[PDB]
Structure 1
Amino acid sequence: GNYSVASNVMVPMRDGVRLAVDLYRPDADGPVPVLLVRNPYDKFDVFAWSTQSTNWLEFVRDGYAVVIQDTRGLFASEGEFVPHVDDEADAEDTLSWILEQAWCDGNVGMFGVSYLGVTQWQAAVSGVGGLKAIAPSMASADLYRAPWYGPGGALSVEALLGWSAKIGTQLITSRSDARPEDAADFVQLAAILNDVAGAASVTPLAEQPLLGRLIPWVIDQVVDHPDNDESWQSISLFERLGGLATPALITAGWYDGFVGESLRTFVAVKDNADARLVVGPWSHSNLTGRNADRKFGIAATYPIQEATTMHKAFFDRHLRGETDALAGVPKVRLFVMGIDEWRDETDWPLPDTAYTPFYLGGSGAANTSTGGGTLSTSISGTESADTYLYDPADPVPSLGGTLLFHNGDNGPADQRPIHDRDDVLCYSTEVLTDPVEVTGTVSARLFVSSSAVDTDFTAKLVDVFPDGRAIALCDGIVRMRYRETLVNPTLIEAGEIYEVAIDMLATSNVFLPGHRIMVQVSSSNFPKYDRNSNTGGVIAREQLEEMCTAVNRIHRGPEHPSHIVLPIIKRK
């Protein structure tokens, strides 16, 4: 039950650069199992991240050692900081050092959230036999796909500018000797964080005098590489995951920026080792279960003590060889929205999933929420088309969804403020008499045309309540040059009809009696994603005046059966 703490122990890497760690070690007569956490936000500052993870001092009281490390070039560590590029090698060297110590029994694991989760996948590909289990929460194994770009090939601009300002702020506050420019730089960084959409609105997007000076990576890597090219593929771990046999405890949230990539990692590792999955209704910075126009109940609040119990059982099985430690623990545990209840499952995707088309239709134009747009399981009878103007100077504002830094605390947001826009097309079912459950991955297939040689298309799933609230669920985008591949883009021909897919991530929701199922279609969602210039040019290098408007069209009928694909679950 007792322990000691040693601060700033210096660990040498292969190139001679030393990284700083803190050691939390139990009172014990011999060696013990060990857990590692790799952190870019100061190893000393434990209260900043721990409330989004576990009550991990319980692990120490129960006989585990815990090691917390400052990553390269930050706080007490030597070297120079660049995101992602040094973390594979630095993790390998750190695991090796731990295994060589007098107090380590040969069994090592990892846990943590966000960047503290990404670094676990980077450690897992090293081939170090002593690493017996990992637990990555709200994370990704492919950095292009989340959080910097996405499956549709658009830049996640609010995520990039917000995070870069956060990193810049801590660099100034952590300086040994203050610089003359520090005071003014601090003020400017606060202005970005108070107004992320404003920061994202300046053209050309690639000209960032403050952020480019403090963290050159923001332009040199992220903005300058819009294709999923060799620079991205190098830091990706995903294709290596299939060859591993390492147990993983994976956590995600329905309104979290990482949700699509978190779920993919579970599917990639489940066949070769013991994988577990937990998904709640959270966004990256709001784990409370409470939002402005939607409350999920006290059961929805991040369950930190239950999480601590589950993590300890998982590590007891895989690090301590206790064969019955996970008795009674489910493989998959989901918070099902609508009914607003936790429920156990045997697999993800769910076994009895019926992937069902809901077709776009209706009399007259589908523009605005008072138009005639419908959704039905029957193919539409008349050939029709809905048309709108997309102007880059006036994009559709982002409201909820998977926002990270710009208003990122209201995932299930009411959509009524944007329903009167002519560029927002709406399609709804009739009012439901019986419940319909949608749990799984979601996508759309649309037949589209444009006056331009490049543009974007968006789709958003919505639950309409009896009182009028139109609550967001999941959404996605396709940038037309990347319609067939993220690696080798090509332009389109003006006026020609194309069939395209939109990846809309995932959800779990029961649409209750008295509700409607609704879909919104458009060509922008700003600043969740950057805006298309409609020119075919290098988007981030263009002035707002260099950009063009586009006349865009959605085709629907017997020969052009545009639809959403819903993962339907029926439980009697």
Structure 2
Amino acid sequence: HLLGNPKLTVTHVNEVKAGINHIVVDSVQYGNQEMIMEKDGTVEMRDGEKLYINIFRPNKDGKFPVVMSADTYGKDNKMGALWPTLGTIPTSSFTPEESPDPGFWVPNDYVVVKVALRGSDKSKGVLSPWSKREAEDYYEVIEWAANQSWSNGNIGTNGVSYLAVTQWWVASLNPPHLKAMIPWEGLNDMYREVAFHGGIPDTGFYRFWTQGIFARWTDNPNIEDLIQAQQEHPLFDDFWKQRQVPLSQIKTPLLTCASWSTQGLHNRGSFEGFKQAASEEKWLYVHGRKEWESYYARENLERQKSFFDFYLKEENNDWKDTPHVIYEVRDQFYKGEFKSASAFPLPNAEYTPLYLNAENHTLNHAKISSAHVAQYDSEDKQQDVSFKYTFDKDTELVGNMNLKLWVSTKDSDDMDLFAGIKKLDRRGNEVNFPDFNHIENGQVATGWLRVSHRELDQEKSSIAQPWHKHETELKLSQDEIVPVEIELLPSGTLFKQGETLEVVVKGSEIVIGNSTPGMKTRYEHEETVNKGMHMIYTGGKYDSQLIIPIV
């Protein structure tokens, strides 16, 4: 049954033509699985635009729950040398990247819908990624699918990256047949999470990705110019306000994956997405491993299936026994302990200030009487200042950290600050983690702040996570000393007794380089306001401090 038919030969993806295909899929789990694929189905939007889709379904009678995903990357798409750190990603041949594998889902009696959103495949309409107008298009395909002859009315959305962002968007519209959702690592506020980091423009990945969309659909003259967008809209203004999902409208039952490894792209938002959703039924899975790798691991496919079985098949399984938070405490690279909790942020987090001392470059439990100033050269990529704490007992830090600094510059009216948290083993050697974008030489946590963008949103800011307004640039007179609070992105790490936490503040990127030379898969921040010495002031009135989430 689920052993498949070794007798049959597998269908190759360019054997399949418009219309009805009977195909034999190379299922990772279930062998040679027969099914029906409708290639180049169309769904008509309110305005008349046709979106193109693929439909994979069991070759049998009945109505089935529907698992759907939607993007603009190519519905028909089909690495060890090229991008060796992507890890192990097993899927059938009928699985575009990050989508639900019909070779897994369909033999378990689901329909899979793969949606090419507006401006992709054979649509030449407006392509405006991760906007409300795209979500409205998605809304209509969900509702269309609830009414078809192979459908049981129950639609669940699923998938990774772009295929997650679009889920946050469309769930915010509350489609009546959206019964469950799995945004498996997706941002939902482009200004704060991909276009800029603490107000500093992303000159790497962001551009890469937007340029990549242009290059894919070359005959489409209607692709939104997001490169110009970034250039024209340096503040969180009306353009960017429309690209922050209204998360608290989400009511749909929710399974979120966040990852400690994705800081600088999907990490901040996956957490905001779980936090802010109004969903009465919501669950969060957090891991410190690789992205696509973890989505397709059998363990996590079974986690997804158990969720969808309960909500789309309405089946009595034990899904609701799942703790609302399951999270990895990272010890080393591909080594840690999974724990559970009933909420994120962790209810038993004790936010603990550690005070910085520029005089001996320590962190400290108690305030520093003596006032002091640490300096570094902001244009020198080899220069930074560090502050370290060695733990006398095993300690786990899980959640947001907040670096609070007093700072000044003299050769400029603005400052770009790059913050990092590193772990140092008992020998004094840095302990590396998976980090963005699939780098293996990463650190514990990372965060950024253009200092003219230091204004706090008081009603959204908290002890562990500052929220910045991004509406007024408060430029600097020299040598004006100002308080900043920097958001270190969510992380989960064990510091054993005799291991060290190091805060690093720098004028440029702290971990340098990426896992694809000559290709900008990682954020880069090459457009900087930095000049001359940065001053970090500590001790006395200058209560510079790191707030840590001890759990």
Which category describes the TM-score, using the shorter chain as reference length?
A: 0.7 to 0.9
Matches within 5 A, 1:226-265: 226-237=234-245, 240-256=246-262, 257-265=265-273
State the match for 2:460 in structure 1.
none
- CA spacing shift, 1:566–1:41, aligned 2, 3 Å: same
State the match for 1:206 in structure 2.
none
State the match for 1:470 in structure 2.
430
Matches within 5 A, 1:13-32: 13-32=45-64
Q: Distance in 1 between matches of 2:285 and 2:94?
A: 22
Structure 2 residue aligned with 1:357, among 353, 360, 365?
353
Tell me if the contact between 1:429 and 1:516 (Cα under 8 Å) persists in the aligned partners.
Answer: yes
Three-state SS of the structure 2 residue aligned to 1:309 is helix
- CA spacing shift, 1:146–1:385, aligned 2, 3 Å: same
Three-state SS of the structure 2 residue aligned to 1:135 is strand
- CA spacing shift, 1:78–1:387, aligned 2, 3 Å: closer
Matches within 5 A, 1:88-487: 88-150=135-197, 152-171=198-217, 217-237=225-245, 240-256=246-262, 257-269=265-277, 272-282=279-289, 287=293, 304-326=297-319, 328-338=321-331, 340-361=336-357, 363=359, 372-391=360-379, 394=380, 396=381, 421=382, 423-430=383-390, 432-451=391-410, 452-471=412-431, 472-484=443-455, 485-487=469-471
Q: Distance in 1 between matches of 2:472 and 2:290?
A: 33
Matches within 5 A, 1:498-517: 498-517=482-501
Letter in 2 for 1:110: T
State the match for 1:401 in structure 2.
none
Three-state SS of the structure 2 residue aligned to 1:481 is helix
Q: Distance in 2 between matches of 1:459 and 1:48?
A: 41
Q: Distance in 2 between matches of 1:215 and 1:244?
A: 28
State the match for 1:201 in structure 2.
none
Structure 2 residue aligned with 1:496, among 477, 480, 485?
480
Letter in 2 for 1:335: E
Q: Distance in 2 between matches of 1:48 and 1:345?
A: 37
Three-state SS of the structure 2 residue aligned to 1:228 is coil
Q: Distance in 1 between matches of 2:223 and 2:74?
A: 18
TM superposition shift of 1:468: 3.7
Instruction: Write out per-residue CA displacement over residues 494-550 of structure 1, whole angstroms, 9 at most, x where no aligned residue.
Output: 22221111011111111113321111112222883525654xxxxxxxxxxxxx723
Q: Distance in 2 between matches of 1:78 and 1:215?
A: 9
Instruction: Write out per-residue CA displacement over residues 429-473 of structure 1, whole angstroms, 9 at most, x where no aligned residue.
Output: 24x442121111111111111212211222211101234422421
Three-state SS of the structure 2 residue aligned to 1:161 is helix
Tell me if the contact between 1:316 and 1:325 (Cα under 8 Å) persists in the aligned partners.
Answer: no
Letter in 2 for 1:514: G
- CA spacing shift, 1:378–1:53, aligned 2, 3 Å: farther
| TM-score normalised to structure 1 length | 0.75
- CA spacing shift, 1:233–1:473, aligned 2, 3 Å: same
TM superposition shift of 1:362: 5.3
Matches within 5 A, 1:536-551: 549-551=531-533
Tell me if the contact between 2:402 and 2:485 (Cα under 8 Å) persists in the aligned partners.
Answer: yes
- Which moves more between the two structures, 20-29 or 245-254? 20-29
Q: Distance in 2 between matches of 1:54 and 1:533?
A: 40
Q: Distance in 2 between matches of 1:24 and 1:49?
A: 11
TM superposition shift of 1:80: 4.3
- Which moves more between the two structures, 327-336 or 4-13? 327-336
State the match for 2:541 in structure 1.
559
1:42 aligns with 2:42: no
Letter in 1 for 2:544: S
Letter in 2 for 1:58: F
Letter in 1 for 2:483: E
Instruction: Write out per-residue CA displacement over residues 62-82 of structure 1, whole angstroms, 9 at most, x where no aligned residue.
Output: 221111011222223343434
Across the two proteins, how many residue pairs are aligned to each other? 463
State the match for 1:200 in structure 2.
none
TM superposition shift of 1:155: 1.3
Letter in 1 for 2:426: P
TM superposition shift of 1:126: 2.2
Tell me if the contact between 2:235 and 2:470 (Cα under 8 Å) persists in the aligned partners.
Answer: yes
Tell me if the contact between 1:19 and 1:78 (Cα under 8 Å) persists in the aligned partners.
Answer: no
User: Normalized per residue, which structure has more strand?
Assistant: 2
Tell me if the contact between 1:98 and 1:104 (Cα under 8 Å) persists in the aligned partners.
Answer: yes
State the match for 1:199 in structure 2.
none
TM superposition shift of 1:260: 1.2
Tell me if the contact between 1:133 and 1:248 (Cα under 8 Å) persists in the aligned partners.
Answer: yes
Q: Distance in 2 between matches of 1:362 and 1:385?
A: 6
- CA spacing shift, 1:28–1:48, aligned 2, 3 Å: closer
- Which moves more between the two structures, 352-361 or 314-323? 314-323
Q: Distance in 2 between matches of 1:49 and 1:264?
A: 28
Tell me if the contact between 1:55 and 1:304 (Cα under 8 Å) persists in the aligned partners.
Answer: no
Extract unaligned runs of 5+ from structure 1.
Answer: 177-212, 288-300, 364-371, 397-420, 535-547
TM superposition shift of 1:127: 3.1
Tell me if the contact between 1:427 and 1:519 (Cα under 8 Å) persists in the aligned partners.
Answer: yes
Tell me if the contact between 1:154 and 1:529 (Cα under 8 Å) persists in the aligned partners.
Answer: no
Letter in 2 for 1:74: S
Tell me if the contact between 1:473 and 1:507 (Cα under 8 Å) persists in the aligned partners.
Answer: yes
Tell me if the contact between 1:56 and 1:308 (Cα under 8 Å) persists in the aligned partners.
Answer: no
- CA spacing shift, 1:329–1:549, aligned 2, 3 Å: closer
Q: Distance in 2 between matches of 1:54 and 1:128?
A: 20
Instruction: Write out per-residue CA displacement over residues 109-130 of structure 1, whole angstroms, 9 at most, x where no aligned residue.
Output: 1001011111112211223211
- Which moves more between the two structures, 354-363 or 326-335? 326-335
Q: Distance in 2 between matches of 1:214 and 1:515?
A: 54
Q: Distance in 1 between matches of 2:94 and 2:500?
A: 40
- CA spacing shift, 1:214–1:319, aligned 2, 3 Å: closer
Three-state SS of the structure 2 residue aligned to 1:387 is strand
- CA spacing shift, 1:454–1:29, aligned 2, 3 Å: same
Three-state SS of the structure 1 residue aligned to 2:163 is helix
Letter in 1 for 2:288: P
Tell me if the contact between 2:329 and 2:339 (Cα under 8 Å) persists in the aligned partners.
Answer: yes
Tell me if the contact between 1:447 and 1:499 (Cα under 8 Å) persists in the aligned partners.
Answer: yes
Letter in 1 for 2:330: M
Three-state SS of the structure 1 residue aligned to 2:352 is strand
Instruction: Write out per-residue CA displacement over residues 77-133 of structure 1, whole angstroms, 9 at most, x where no aligned residue.
Output: 343434234412211221222123222222111001011111112211223211111
Q: Distance in 1 between matches of 2:44 and 2:77?
A: 23
Q: Distance in 1 between matches of 2:55 and 2:408?
A: 60
Tell me if the contact between 1:54 and 1:308 (Cα under 8 Å) persists in the aligned partners.
Answer: no
- CA spacing shift, 1:466–1:265, aligned 2, 3 Å: same
* Structure 1 moving runs of 4+ over 4 Å: 46-56, 213-216
Structure 2 residue aligned with 1:530, among 525, 532, 536?
525
- CA spacing shift, 1:100–1:234, aligned 2, 3 Å: same
Q: Distance in 1 between matches of 2:538 and 2:216?
A: 52
- CA spacing shift, 1:533–1:121, aligned 2, 3 Å: closer
Three-state SS of the structure 2 residue aligned to 1:134 is strand
1:8 aligns with 2:4: no
